[PDB]
Amino acid sequence: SGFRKMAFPSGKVEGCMVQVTCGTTTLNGLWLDDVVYCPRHVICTSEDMLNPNYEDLLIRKSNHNFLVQAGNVQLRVIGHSMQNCVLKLKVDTANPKTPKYKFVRIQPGQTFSVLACYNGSPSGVYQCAMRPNFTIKGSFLNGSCGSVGFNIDYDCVSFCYMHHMELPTGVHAGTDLEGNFYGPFVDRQTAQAAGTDTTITVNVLAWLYAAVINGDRWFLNRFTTTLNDFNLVAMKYNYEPLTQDHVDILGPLSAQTGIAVLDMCASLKELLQNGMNGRTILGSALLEDEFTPFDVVRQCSGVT
Amino acid sequence: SGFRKMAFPSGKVEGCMVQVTCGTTTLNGLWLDDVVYCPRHVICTSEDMLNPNYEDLLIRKSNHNFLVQAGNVQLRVIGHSMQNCVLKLKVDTANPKTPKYKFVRIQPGQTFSVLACYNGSPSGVYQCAMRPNFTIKGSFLNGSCGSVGFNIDYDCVSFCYMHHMELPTGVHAGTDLEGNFYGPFVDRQTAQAAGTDTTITVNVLAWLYAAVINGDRWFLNRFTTTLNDFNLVAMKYNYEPLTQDHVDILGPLSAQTGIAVLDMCASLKELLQNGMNGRTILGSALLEDEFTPFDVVRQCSGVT
């Protein structure tokens, strides 16, 4: 029993972290096979970041300008290319600790673990979600760029995020491992405002199911609702619309607890309308939305 | 910017997890050098757990009865002994992945990361605190016993906790790596009730400092208080007494933000008396107490 914001074990990813330096900028890189991936803004000076022309800035860079260090040993760079907003540095040595891996582009609402790194060294691991406005709420200081987000399926690491920047509001923006930013963000130090940070409804319902499984049941009421009725309330509270696909995804949790998805929606509707009244659910005084239905099943069944 | 409940990178500990089986019971063990540490209740049947005589039960066990598997390979047990509530299984092979390590017994209020494991395999990592009633609020299912809690200082892992049991209230109890339980708990399936789960005041203040550093400042007021005045309010709200030692520990955070510790105490006093009024601090609607002043400094400075 008990339910925690749990991250994947980070060992497999720790073995891939390297330091990348270009000129006076040092950030992190991900070493998989004989390629090191890192944000292309490693080639920029803080000045260049105001209006960078990456192709032009890259022309002044040679392989020997990218210093890649794995632990305390230097890697030899034999090629470099830009793919969208990431640089791929070909090295002469395949990473011996390369795990089985995939590059995936996640959708908003999906969660992942972040291994925060500085100078190619892991500092901590925490669990995040891709917000509906394509930002993440991380914990990143200067030097953390190139830190990655990932999910693990037994022994295969699916990398989904690479840290690139902090918006002036303190939220974070980054790319998938193909260098495409999540959302409309750009690797430029300019006016970039995030949209509405709506609540991930399907995740809240999943977490309410986790609460029932773990004994916190005070919020269960005698009501039911419909998808259309619930969605009128969801719109009012800046919650994402609940679809039949979400109801289907919640099916295993509904089966395990015996609580119909629409009955849980009515409980959530009353929680939104009446508040928590000073009470807590799974140690939280707010409705938690950074657990997917898959995370709830995984944590409640002990998948390794 | 941003502040997350962050766990230490778990790689160093993942390399130490093994599976221990005795009869029909399988749990986790920690393999450091040529010793595997595990809860002594591995020798019990669910029946034995009602009133176990561990010394007597252990007489019927030989080295060959403890099956230790590291990954998919079997370790040879050449000795076994009981130290308090843990078994030490001497194996013929030193763990090649043994990190630099120490065994430490933490005090209530101290935080640590837990690597939840099943069948010797890591399932997830999360951050915990030793509660003032010597329980922890973890996420542990059957099979998770022997999962460990730890802190890391650069390359040295200080193991502080080994999971042993869940109380009938859903909270967790375990030992240090010398086998001594935290608190009054015993490895017996009997009536064990936890005491008052008071709030770790020094940690709340540390987290309020983290909030100020990260821009969440609405709760800062025009007031100050004294240690004695604040402590009268702390007693009323089941908060731990704040001592001059705690004020001293908060010194670096007070210096960085320019907010005197007693002024932050007055802000906390008003938060306790008036509530949050539907507002949040660092994404939380309750006062968070599972970040120590050291964790706040570490996360705010990027220690690797």
Under 8 Å between Cβ of A218 and A279:
yes
Domain check: are A180 and A69 in the same one?
no
Residue type, position A122, single letter: P
Domain check: are B5 and B153 in the same one?
yes
Domain check: are A132 and A185 in the same one?
yes
Alpha helices in chain A (DSSP H): 11-14, 54-59, 201-213, 227-236, 244-249, 251-257, 261-274, 293-301
Domain check: are B3 and B120 in the same one?
yes
Domain check: are B104 and B9 in the same one?
yes
Of B197, B231, B252, which residue constitutes the final position of a domain? B197
Residue A113 bridge partners (DSSP): A127, A150
CA distance readout (Å), B222 to A9, B206, B258, B264, B265: 44, 19, 14, 10, 12
Q: Is B232 helix (H, G, I), strand (E, B) or coil?
A: helix
> What is the spatial distance between Cα A174 and Cα B10, in angstroms, rounded to a whole number?
24
> What is the spatial distance between Cα A113 and Cα A126, in angstroms, rounded to a whole number?
6
CA distance B139 to chain A (A): 4
Domain check: are A177 and A227 in the same one?
no
Task: Indicate which residue of A145, A163, A172, A265 is catalytic.
Answer: A145
Q: Tokens 């040092």 map to which residue?
A: A26
Asked how this structure was determined, the answer is X-ray
DSSP B236: H
> Which of A99, A26, A124, A122 has its CA nearest to residue A69?
A26
What DSSP string runs through B6-42? -BPP-HHHHTTEEEEEETTEEEEEEEETTEEEEEGGG
> What is the spatial distance between Cα B186 and Cα B174, in angstroms, rounded to a whole number?
9
Of residues B6, B285, B302, nearest to A118 (C-beta): B302
Most A CBs within 10 A among B1, B16, B112, hence the mutation to make, goes to: B1
Provide the domain limits for residue A284.
198-301
Total domains, chain B: 3
Resolution (A): 1.6
Structure tokens of B188? 């017996």
Domain check: are B4 and B139 in the same one?
yes
CA distance readout (Å), B194 to A10, A236, B133, B204, B220: 33, 42, 6, 22, 34
Domain check: are A174 and A128 in the same one?
yes
> What is the spatial distance between Cα B235 and Cα B133, in angstroms, rounded to a whole number?
15
- B141 contacts A1? CB cut-off 8 A: yes
Q: What is the CATH number of the domain that holds B243?
A: 1.10.1840.10
Domain check: are B262 and B286 in the same one?
yes
Domain check: are B105 and B9 in the same one?
yes
Residue B23: half-sphere exposure toward Cβ, Cα within 13 Å: 14
Structure tokens of A237? 């509270």
Calculate the CA B202 to chain-centre distance: 17
What is the number of other CB atoms lying within 10 angstroms of the CB of residue A201? 24
User: Phi and psi (nearest 5°) for A76?
Assistant: -90, 120
Of residues A4, A115, A137, nearest to B2 (C-beta): A137
Of A79, A99, A119, which residue constitutes the final position of a domain? A99
Under 8 Å between Cβ of A172 and A166:
yes
Q: What is the CATH number of the domain that holds A27?
A: 2.40.10.10
Under 8 Å between Cβ of A109 and A129:
yes
Q: Is A41 helix (H, G, I), strand (E, B) or coil?
A: helix
Among chain A residues, the shortest Cα distance to B122 is held by A304
Domain check: are A61 and A191 in the same one?
no
Q: Which residues 6+ apart lie within 8 Å of B62 measured at CB?
A: none
Q: Is A93 helix (H, G, I), strand (E, B) or coil?
A: coil
Under 8 Å between Cβ of B146 and B28:
yes
Domain check: are B104 and B7 in the same one?
yes
Q: Look at strands B121-129 and B66-70 and give their pairing.
A: unpaired
